[PDB]
């Protein structure tokens, strides 16, 4: 009896995308040129799959995510599957290899504003470029799917404020007068920036800017 041997001890990474129902990954074969039962190789996933999401077809050697099962990067981002090939000799001989599965991200999580709504109070005489607020956000995705962009979508009368798209820092953009406009109800919007902007997700909320009185 000869042991069934795999070409490589590790093969990877194999890209599988989250949200994708039961996809094939790849075929994995052990070499074993014995006769009869000493060369009947059976395959199985023996470690690394704690939620039961994967299976290898016992004769063909095709690893897949199970039928009707979708992977999720936010619960598990990577898998190290131990594959076993065992013959039907006595004793049964066996070998194992490792398969790395990288779970590729989709944009399946909205950004969230962390510190809005907020009410800020500034001098009516605050000069252009003065600090108003620092808007903050998080996103559970990775890569471009969690890269966040800010902008003011409503209530920014006579272009009176500016927000840096990258940082989320709101500053004064024009001169202000309390006797013209005492209060600004700004709608600040944070969005992610996926490859395809048709699936971009957002969060909106109020930044209220109230001007304190001064001389004239």
Q: Which of 34, 42, 70, 205 binds Ca ion (CB under 5 A)?
A: 34
Question: Binders of K ion among 148-207, rule CB under 5 A?
Answer: 203
Alpha-carbon Rg for the chain in angstroms: 29
* Binding partner at 203 among Ca ion, K ion, none, C-beta below 5 to 8 Å by kind: K ion
Count the neighbouring beta carbons within 10 Å of the beta carbon of residue 11: 16
In this complex, which beta carbon is closest to Ca ion, that of residue 46 or of residue 181? 181
Q: Supply 4's token pair.
A: 């069934």
In this complex, which beta carbon is closest to K ion, that of residue 32 or of residue 203? 203
d(CA 187, CA 62) in angstroms, rounded, equals 52
Core vs surface per residue 145-180: b (16+ CB within 10 A) or e: bbebbbbbeebbeeebbbbeeeebebebbeebebee
* Binding partner at 141 among Ca ion, K ion, none, C-beta below 5 to 8 Å by kind: Ca ion
SS3 111: coil
Question: Binders of Ca ion among 135-194, rule CB under 5 A?
Answer: 139, 141, 145, 177, 192
d(CA 123, CA 107) in angstroms, rounded, equals 41
Window of 44-52, 58-66, 81-89, 96-104 that interacts with Ca ion by CB under 5 A: 81-89
> Site residues (CB under 5 A) for K ion?
203
> Site residues (CB under 5 A) for Ca ion?
1-2, 18, 32, 34, 38, 72-74, 87, 105, 107-109, 124, 139, 141, 145, 177, 192, 213, 216
């Amino acid at each position: 009896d000869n042991v069934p041997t795999f070409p490589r001890d590790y093969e990877g990474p194999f890209d599988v995308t989250e949200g994708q129902p039961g996809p094939r990954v790849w075929t994995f074969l052990a070499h074993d040129r014995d006769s009869g039962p000493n060369g009947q190789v059976e395959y199985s996933v023996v470690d690394g799959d704690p939620l039961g999401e994967f299976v290898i077809s016992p004769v063909e050697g095709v690893l897949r995510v199970r039928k009707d099962v979708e992977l999720d990067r936010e619960t598990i981002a990577f898998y190290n599957l131990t594959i076993c090939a065992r013959d039907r000799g006595v004793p049964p001989l066996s070998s194992t290899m490792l398969v790395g599965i990288r779970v590729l991200d989709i944009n399946d999580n909205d950004p969230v504003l962390l510190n809005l709504p907020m009410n800020v109070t500034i001098s009516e005489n605050s000069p252009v470029s003065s600090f108003v607020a620092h808007v903050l956000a998080s996103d559970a995705d990775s890569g471009c799917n969690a890269l966040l962009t800010f902008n003011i979508t409503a209530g920014n009368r006579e272009r009176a404020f500016f927000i840096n798209a990258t940082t989320g820092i709101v500053t004064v953009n024009r001169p202000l007068d309390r006797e013209r406009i005492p209060e600004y109800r700004l709608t600040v919007s944070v969005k992610d920036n996926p490859e395809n902007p048709r699936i971009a997700r957002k969060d909106f909320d109020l930044l209220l800017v109230s001007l304190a009185d001064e001389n004239d």
